[PDB]
Design a protein around this nucleic acid. Structure first.
Length: 104
DNA sequence: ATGACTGGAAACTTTTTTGTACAACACTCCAATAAACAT
């Protein structure tokens, strides 16, 4: 898709994600570049995200109605022979990568 | 479990009758006026 040069500039800078350091003395300040896109439905906004997930090394893709508070980061037991085992969602396995959330 | 039911459910359309707002209207008056009836 040709056009929207200002949109393509923000996608390349967000791929690096910066360098999360510790600028304070006791507080851990996060250092990630978070970009929130929102356009008029009709200019194909989801096709701009399907390109960065193939040129990177780790990227996922989820929807809105396909997940909730359970399938997010952590949620119960193993009801087979009295056991307890915690699970994880989708943001934990996507370490040091670029996450793509559709229908927010 | 999430995904399935009934169970309730907040803005939000409708009217609306309220005052106002401005429309006429018969309008008393007028202002010569004009002819007439004196000169």
């Amino acid at each position: 898709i040709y056009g929207h040069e200002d949109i393509k500039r923000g996608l390349a800078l967000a791929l690096f994600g910066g360098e999360p350091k510790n600028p304070g003395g006791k507080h851990k300040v996060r250092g990630d570049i978070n970009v929130l896109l929102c356009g008029d439905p009709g200019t194909a906004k989801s096709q701009f995200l399907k390109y960065i997930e193939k040129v990177s090394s780790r990227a996922i893709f989820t929807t809105g109605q396909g997940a909730s508070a359970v399938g997010l980061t952590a949620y119960q037991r193993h009801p087979v022979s009295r056991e307890w085992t915690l699970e994880a969602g989708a943001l934990v396995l996507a370490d040091r990568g670029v996450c793509l959330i559709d229908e927010f």
